């Protein structure tokens, strides 16, 4: 099998943002990292002026700016998830603009397990070295000096194995690190000096101190203060060589502070964001001395307002703050001196679209022209919403829900979408549960609730704890034209909605919304009860038609030739819709794995679990039971699966990879007829949550599968012929010899299948983005690529422009 | 000695061993022939590792699988002039058999491919937000597990699955659930006695479950420790009826009757006078068992108790023994002891086993 | 040899197990006689003895081996039933 993978919408989720002087010394820049993309802007007081946007062959993990002594502008350091390090420089040749790789080199080790807190990348203030913390027990040091083009580094043994955060201190004669670590005694702050000549750790400027057992971040305060600030769940403490000051502000106890940014270059003010969108400012009050020295007088924290759930923050000129958000739209906010008539000092100025995370989606034709439009379940918590993507090229419309959407399906006969959603409520003294804010499930025109005395759990005393978050699930009906929340049906207490399907069954004319749920209780590890509720949308309200009680979680459901096929724990059960509007068990097939994923094409069904266990089944009419055709048990975390054709199955497995399994051609054998050979391997660099058959356009390529990712990237996979794959595979090796990669990262090393303890070259996949880049190069370069292998530059223009038409 | 995986390595084979050994199971050996002394002494000064062979069809010498066993102890008795090598070994890595050659001295050397131990990372490592990386270190029981799940699997909101599903594939949660189930059978179980590593814990549990040889083979075929833990936990919840192996359908006892009389657990290995080893499972009550002969205290594995042979009421196959107390003050006055090799784990009223 | 030998070895093995209540002594008398059968017949009377008794004698040894593992006295009784069937047929001549 041979496939062509191309990006339709680039990743929108922001994972990093920094400010500095990268393009010139006289311009203030704003650099934004969006997984594999880097955007460069110039702050001018009227907003952000786009200047340069590039793509890298790697998942940007670290991104920091620094200015060595001899440099006129700032240099940019980037480390990737595959440990590709590079020092970059912005170069403008009048009209042409180019990112230059001053230094580069892979910094991974042959041994060592990735650290628990992930990659930490810090640069010394006086640009003497780059410190990296990749594995537990080691601290990699890349010495910063002129002729170090290969980014050669050395490792220093670190005794403290469970380091949470680390930073380089300011105003120190020798490079000094300050970090928090956890040992069986608790958490502690410690300092260490780094001597490049010695290649070892010397004693730090101040002795080890104890911190809050929940201390999570370290902020090195620039001069005149020096020292460091340790932030935990309930305390903010300062520490330097001769002083310490601690505060326990009750205004921070509701949520954990997880991101910070410095406002004043001297460290007088610092913005702080939590997991729920609250934005705070920390003031380092100063008591100046007669000799110009400054001591820390007191610490004060004040809540400013509400922003989108912030991943990273960056102060820009005059009250303007950029809010990078992984879970919602990124923003440009204004920090007003006087509060508005609501009480917030923060006011939104601009909103930047963020599809990420895409949990589910579907393709639908609404204006009824022939062009399919994608409707995704995006965001989470207050950022949760629906996004309609149409074919600047892609037009996006947002429908805010203020709660987490989970599943989506389109009902043609009702002109409305069905969306499973969840809202967080908290127990109150009254004895019930109260919601944090109004949302789609609480603002519907009409609402309904489930009832079930017959579904009383035995081991559940229902003595729910006080002040505990409770997740309430609902099924929302949303109009396809106005997108208003028409109806909201709440499920039973402790009931978790998992699967959703809209279909007709048997001889019944009525299309129904069917939901597969699970009864989740804290005491029970695995659900022992579940429900398959059938719903009919009539008179702008949802009415239950049939309710079937099952002994397990209904992880997935699908329409199978007029019947309902559901997956309850390990069993794959088929049901028939009788003339009395009831579900009746037709047959059961017990599997040896958890039936999480369930797809069907024709008479065969694909079953999968979270550990990439793929088993094929076929419903035999004579037997009245299912039969295993083939199986592959290659243990690895699988996030999504899809049937490409009768003998090809596309999936997404751990370390942001795509794979295709093929059914053997039955070459006078039986043990290989039940074996699925892996023919496709590719490192996408995105975490796929959903595959979807369909297209957004009005046949050299066979088939069309769209997919949504955590970073909001939308991609497309299509099959190719034998002759078409070899020509495009030849053109990739040719384009890689000419195209200049930012950081000088080889395309073969970026797309090769990679896991923590395994790496193999990519097979059966064509990087469509690389092929489409051929058109975006100068005419003399276009001919350089097609030199020999007959095939002129002009001939390969309509070939690539034909592949462009697919998306 | 832990050789590289997915590579074909030649390992010496011990001729007098034809029994399936689970990684990390005590196998005391007592060799005597000089053909099994000059090789056991050659390995002691090189790598200290011999190969135990598993035969699917013991009657036709069909060997397609096996597991290595590192030599960790050496003692040589000079009794009556005849050299006796007394060595104890422990199982390390599973291997597959491809081709076994025969030498001209009396040893077989086979090129075996070591099947990898698939160590997967955490399910949240590829989806954890960088801002929340610093919230993964928990500071240092029913409500503690609720907060453990709520914090470790918080990022499940970015995927298509909930937090409770990810707990079903979490090594720490699975091992804790198995420990609770094992505690029901052994009130005298010590936590320090069980390994903390998911690889060693899974193999230790596989050698403690009262299951037939076919199921022991199935668990060893599994490559990941997560799937092996899940299958072991599924056996404990579903295979509640223990039946006679020969009859396949005659029930003998139930899971709820399993208990531990001594401090070696509910199914310890004991050796009879003739030297045969019996992994004996102790239960309070049994059905379809007839008693043969009279009680005897000779060679009793449990002090203060007399044994009486027990057999299948339908097929007359040996199942184990009944233990009657000699003193009227012993609390478990009467209990049963069943040899593992005589029983068939069965799922009562057909569901199968999940990985 | 073989006839009078097996005959005199079963009388002594019965006197040790039934009379003296000593399993070890009985197996000591029986083991060499069974080992002789494993070597094979080398005389006509020896060959004639393996044709009629050989199969019955090798099954009582398997029943003795079953007792050594199980510890079931009935398995030794099954071996002794076969030993007495052969002992009587030997006594017939
Ligand atoms: C003296 O016993 C024998 C003579 S021939 C075989 C045996 C024998 C005894 N056992 C068990 C019975 C139960 C027990 O507590 N200890 C054992 O050793 N298994 N086989
Ligand atoms: Zn039986």
Swiss-Prot record, chain A:
Keywords associated with the record: Acetylation, Biological rhythms, Cytoplasm, Disease variant, DNA damage, DNA repair, DNA-binding, Host-virus interaction, Intellectual disability, Isopeptide bond, Nucleus, Phosphoprotein, Repeat, Ubl conjugation, Ubl conjugation pathway
Cellular localisation: Cytoplasm; Nucleus
Keyword match Zinc: no
Transmembrane feature ranges: none
Record's comment on post-translational modification: Phosphorylated by ABL1. Ubiquitinated by CUL4A. Subsequently degraded by ubiquitin-dependent proteolysis.
Region annotated WD repeat beta-propeller A, chain positions: 12-355
Stretch list, region WD repeat beta-propeller C: 393-720
GO cellular component, one term: Cul4B-RING E3 ubiquitin ligase complex
N6-acetyllysine PTM positions: 744
Assembly mode: Component of the UV-DDB complex which includes DDB1 and DDB2; the heterodimer dimerizes to give rise to a heterotetramer when bound to damaged DNA. The UV-DDB complex interacts with monoubiquitinated histone H2A and binds to XPC via the DDB2 subunit. Component of numerous DCX (DDB1-CUL4-X-box) E3 ubiquitin-protein ligase complexes which consist of a core of DDB1, CUL4A or CUL4B and RBX1. DDB1 may recruit specific substrate targeting subunits to the DCX complex. (Microbial infection) Interacts with Simian virus 5 protein V.
UniProt-recorded name of the protein: DNA damage-binding protein 1
Organism: Homo sapiens (Human)
Top-level taxonomy: Eukaryota, Metazoa, Chordata, Craniata, Vertebrata
Curated annotation (Swiss-Prot), chain B:
Post-translational modification: Ubiquitinated, ubiquitination is mediated by its own DCX protein ligase complex.
UniProt: (S)-thalidomide binding residues: 299, 301, 307
Domain Lon N-terminal: 11-240
Residues holding Zn(2+): 244, 247, 312, 315
GO biological process assignments: locomotory exploration behavior; negative regulation of monoatomic ion transmembrane transport; negative regulation of protein-containing complex assembly; positive regulation of protein-containing complex assembly; positive regulation of Wnt signaling pathway; proteasome-mediated ubiquitin-dependent protein catabolic process; protein ubiquitination
Gene Ontology cellular-component terms listed: Cul4A-RING E3 ubiquitin ligase complex; cytoplasm; cytosol; membrane; nucleus; perinuclear region of cytoplasm
Consequence of substituting residue 307 to A: Abolishes thalidomide-binding without affecting DCX protein ligase complex activity
One of the record's GO molecular function terms: transmembrane transporter binding
Subcellular location: Cytoplasm; Nucleus; Membrane
Alphabetic keyword roster: Cytoplasm, Disease variant, Intellectual disability, Membrane, Metal-binding, Nucleus, Phosphoprotein, Ubl conjugation, Ubl conjugation pathway, Zinc
Involved pathway(s): Protein modification; protein ubiquitination
Phosphoprotein listed as a keyword: yes
Membrane topology summary: Peripheral membrane protein
Broad class of where this protein is predominantly found: cytoplasm
Tissue spec. comment: Widely expressed. Highly expressed in brain.
Domain CULT residue range list: 239-347
Note: Thalidomide was widely prescribed to pregnant women in the late 1950s as a sedative and as treatment against morning sickness. Thalidomide was found to be teratogenic, causing multiple birth defects. More recently, thalidomide use has increased for the treatment of multiple myeloma and erythema nodosum leprosum, a painful complication of leprosy.
Quaternary structure and partners: Interacts with KCNT1. Component of a DCX (DDB1-CUL4-X-box) protein ligase complex, at least composed of CRBN, CUL4A, DDB1 and RBX1. Interacts directly with DDB1. Interacts (in pomalidomide-bound form) with IKZF1 and IKZF3. Interacts with ILF2. Interacts with TRAF6 and ECSIT.
Family that this chain belongs to: Belongs to the CRBN family.
Curated annotation (Swiss-Prot), chain C:
Region described as Sufficient for interaction with the FKBP1A/rapamycin complex: 1-93
Membrane-traversing stretches: none
Record's comment on post-translational modification: Autophosphorylates when part of mTORC1 or mTORC2. Phosphorylation in the kinase domain modulates the interactions of MTOR with RPTOR and AKT1S1/PRAS40 and leads to increased intrinsic mTORC1 kinase activity. Ubiquitinated at Lys-45 by the SCF(FBXO22) complex via 'Lys-27'-linked ubiquitination prevents mTORC1 substrate recruitment.
Covalent link Glycyl lysine isopeptide (Lys-Gly) (interchain with G-Cter in ubiquitin), residues: 45
Tissues showing expression: Expressed in numerous tissues, with highest levels in testis.
Subcellular localization: Lysosome membrane; Endoplasmic reticulum membrane; Golgi apparatus membrane; Cell membrane
Superkingdom field: Eukaryota
Disorder association: Smith-Kingsmore syndrome: An autosomal dominant syndrome characterized by intellectual disability, macrocephaly, seizures, umbilical hernia, and facial dysmorphic features. Focal cortical dysplasia 2: A form of focal cortical dysplasia, a malformation of cortical development that results in medically refractory epilepsy in the pediatric population and in adults. FCORD2 is a severe form, with onset usually in childhood, characterized by disrupted cortical lamination and specific cytological abnormalities. It is classified in 2 subtypes: type IIA characterized by dysmorphic neurons and lack of balloon cells; type IIB with dysmorphic neurons and balloon cells.
Domain comment in the entry: The kinase domain (PI3K/PI4K) is intrinsically active but has a highly restricted catalytic center.
Quaternary structure annotation from Swiss-Prot or TrEMBL: Part of the mechanistic target of rapamycin complex 1 (mTORC1) which contains MTOR, MLST8 and RPTOR. The mTORC1 complex is a 1 Md obligate dimer of two stoichiometric heterotetramers with overall dimensions of 290 A x 210 A x 135 A. It has a rhomboid shape and a central cavity, the dimeric interfaces are formed by interlocking interactions between the two MTOR and the two RPTOR subunits.
């Amino acid at each position: 099998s041979y496939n062509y993978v191309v990006t339709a919408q680039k990743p929108t989720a922001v994972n990093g943002c920094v400010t500095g002087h990268f393009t010139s010394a006289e311009d203030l820049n704003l650099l934004i990292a969006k997984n594999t993309r880097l955007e460069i802007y110039v702050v001018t007081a009227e907003g952000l002026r786009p200047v340069k946007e590039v793509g890298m062959y790697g998942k940007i993990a670290v991104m920091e700016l620094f200015r060595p002594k001899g440099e006129s502008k700032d240099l940019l350091f980037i480390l990737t998830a595959k440990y590709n390090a590079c020092i970059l420089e912005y170069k403008q040749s009048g009209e042409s603009i180019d990112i230059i790789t001053r230094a580069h080199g892979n910094v991974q080790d042959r041994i060592g397990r990735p650290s628990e807190t992930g990659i930490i990348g810090i640069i010394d203030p006086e640009c003497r070295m780059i410190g990296l913390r990749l594995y537990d027990g080691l601290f990699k040091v890349i010495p910063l000096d002129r002729d170090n083009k290969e980014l050669k580094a050395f490792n220093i043994r670190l005794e403290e194995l469970h380091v949470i955060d680390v930073k380089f201190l300011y105003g120190c004669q020798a490079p000094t690190i300050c970090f928090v670590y956890q040992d069986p005694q608790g958490r502690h702050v410690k300092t260490y000096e780094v001597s490049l000549r010695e290649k070892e750790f010397n004693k730090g400027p101040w002795k080890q101190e104890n911190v809050e057992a929940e201390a999570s971040m370290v902020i090195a305060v620039p001069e005149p203060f020096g020292g460091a600030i340790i932030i935990g769940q309930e305390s903010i403490t300062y520490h330097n060589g001769d002083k310490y000051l601690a505060i326990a502000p009750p205004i921070i106890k509701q949520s954990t502070i997880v991101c910070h940014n410095r406002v004043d270059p001297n460290g007088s003010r610092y913005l702080l964001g939590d997991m729920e969108g609250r934005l705070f400012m920390l003031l380092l009050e100063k008591e100046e001395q007669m000799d110009g020295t400054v001591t820390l007088k007191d610490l004060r924290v004040e809540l400013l307002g509400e922003t989108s759930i912030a991943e990273c923050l960056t102060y820009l000129d005059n009250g303007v703050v950029f809010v990078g958000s992984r879970l919602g739209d990124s923003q440009l906010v204004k920090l007003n001196v006087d509060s508005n008539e609501q009480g917030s000092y923060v006011v939104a100025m601009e909103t930047f679209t963020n599809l990420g995370p895409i949990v589910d989606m579907c393709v639908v034709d609404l204006e009824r022209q022939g062009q399919g439009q994608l409707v995704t379940c995006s965001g989470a918590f207050k950022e949760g919403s629906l996004r309609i993507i149409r074919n600047q090229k892609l037009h996006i419309r947002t429908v805010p829900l203020y709660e987490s959407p989970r599943k989506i399906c389109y009902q043609e006969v009702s002109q409305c979408f069905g969306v499973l959603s969840s809202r967080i409520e908290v127990q109150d003294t009254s004895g019930g549960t109260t919601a944090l804010r109004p949302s789609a499930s609480t603002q519907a025109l009409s609402s309904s609730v489930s009832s079930s005395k017959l579904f009383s759990s035995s081991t559940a005393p229902h003595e729910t704890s006080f002040g505990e978050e409770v997740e309430v699930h609902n099924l929302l009906i949303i109009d396809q034209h106005t997108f208003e929340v028409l109806h909201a049906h709440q499920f039973l207490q402790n009931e978790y909605a998992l699967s959703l399907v809209s279909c007709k069954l048997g001889k019944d004319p009525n299309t129904y919304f069917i939901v597969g749920t699970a009864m989740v209780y804290p005491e029970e590890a695995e659900p022992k009860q579940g429900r398959i509720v059938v719903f009919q949308y009539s008179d702008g309200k949802l009415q239950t038609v049939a309710e079937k009680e099952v002994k397990g979680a209904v992880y997935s459901m699908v329409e199978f030739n007029g019947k309902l096929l559901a997956s309850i724990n390990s069993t794959v059960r088929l049901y028939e819709w009788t003339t009395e509007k009831e579900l009746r068990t037709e047959c059961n097939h017990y599997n040896n794995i958890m039936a999480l994923y369930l797809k069907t094409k024709g008479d065969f069904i694909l079953v999968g679990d979270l550990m990439r266990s793929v088993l094929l089944l076929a419903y035999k009419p004579m037997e009245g039971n299912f039969e295993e055709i083939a199986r592959d048990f290659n243990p690895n975390w699988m996030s999504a699966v899809e049937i490409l054709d009768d003998d090809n199955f596309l999936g997404a497995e751990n370390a942001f990879n795509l794979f295709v399994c093929q059914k053997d051609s039955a070459a006078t054998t039986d043990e290989e007829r039940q074996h699925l050979q892996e023919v496709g391997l590719f490192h996408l660099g995105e975490f796929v949550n959903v595959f979807c058959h369909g297209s957004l356009v009005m046949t050299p390529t066979q088939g069309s599968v769209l997919f949504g990712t955590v970073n909001g990237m939308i991609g497309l996979v299509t099959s190719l012929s034998e002759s078409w794959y070899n020509l495009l595979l030849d053109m990739q090796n040719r384009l890689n010899k000419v195209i200049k990669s930012v950081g000088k990262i080889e395309h073969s090393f970026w797309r090769s299948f990679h896991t923590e303890r395994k790496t193999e070259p990519a097979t059966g996949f064509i990087d469509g983005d690389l092929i489409e880049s051929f058109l975006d190069i100068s005419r003399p370069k276009m001919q350089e690529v097609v030199a020999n292998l007959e095939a002129t530059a002009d001939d390969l223009i309509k070939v690539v422009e034909e592949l462009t038409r697919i998306h | 000695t832990l050789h590289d995986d997915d590579s074909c390595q030649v390992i010496p084979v011990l001729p007098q061993v034809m029994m399936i050994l689970i990684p990390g199971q005590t196998l005391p050996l007592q060799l005597f022939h000089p053909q099994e002394v000059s090789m056991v002494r050659n390995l002691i000064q090189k790598d200290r590792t011999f190969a135990v062979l598993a035969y699917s069809n013991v009657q036709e010498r069909e060997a397609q699988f096996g597991t290595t066993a590192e030599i960790y102890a050496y003692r040589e008795e000079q009794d009556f002039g005849i050299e006796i090598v007394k060595v104890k070994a422990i199982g390390r890595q599973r291997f597959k058999v491809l081709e076994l050659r025969t030498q001209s001295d009396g040893i077989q050397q086979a090129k075996v491919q070591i099947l990898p131990e698939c160590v997967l990372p955490s399910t949240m490592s590829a989806v954890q937000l960088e801002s929340l990386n610093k919230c993964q270190i928990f500071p240092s029981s029913y409500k503690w597990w609720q907060k453990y799940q709520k914090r470790k699997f918080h990022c499940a909101n970015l995927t298509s699955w909930p937090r409770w599903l990810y707990s079903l594939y979490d090594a720490e949660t699975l091992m804790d659930r198995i420990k609770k189930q094992l505690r029901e059978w052994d009130e005298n179980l010590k936590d320090d006695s069980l390994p903390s590593n998911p690889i060693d814990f899974s193999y230790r549990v596989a050698a403690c479950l009262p299951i037939d040889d076919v199921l022991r083979i199935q668990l060893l075929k599994i490559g990941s420790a997560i799937q092996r833990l899940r299958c072991e936990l599924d056996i404990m919840n579903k295979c509640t009826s223990l039946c006679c192996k020969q009859c396949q359908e005659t029930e003998i006892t139930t899971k709820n009757e399993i208990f531990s009389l001594s401090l070696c657990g509910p199914m310890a290995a004991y050796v009879n006078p003739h030297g045969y080893v019996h992994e004996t499972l102790t239960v309070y009550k049994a059905c379809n068992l007839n008693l043969i002969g009279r009680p005897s205290t000779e060679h009793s594995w449990f002090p203060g108790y007399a044994w009486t042979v027990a057999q299948c009421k339908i097929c007359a196959s040996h199942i184990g023994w009944k233990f009657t107390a000699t003193k009227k003050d012993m609390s478990p006055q009467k209990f049963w002891g069943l040899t593992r090799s005589a029983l068939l784990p069965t799922i009562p009223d057909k569901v199968i086993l999940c990985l | 040899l073989w006839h009078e030998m097996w005959h005199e070895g079963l009388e002594e093995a019965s006197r040790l197990y039934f009379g003296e209540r000593n399993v070890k002594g009985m197996f000591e008398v029986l083991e060499p006689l069974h080992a002789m059968m494993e070597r094979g017949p080398q005389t006509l009377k020896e060959t004639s003895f393996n044709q009629a008794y050989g199969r019955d004698l090798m099954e009582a040894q398997e029943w003795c081996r079953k007792y050594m593992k199980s510890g079931n006295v009935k398995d030794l009784t099954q071996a002794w039933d076969l030993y007495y069937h052969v002992f009587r047929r030997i006594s017939k001549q």
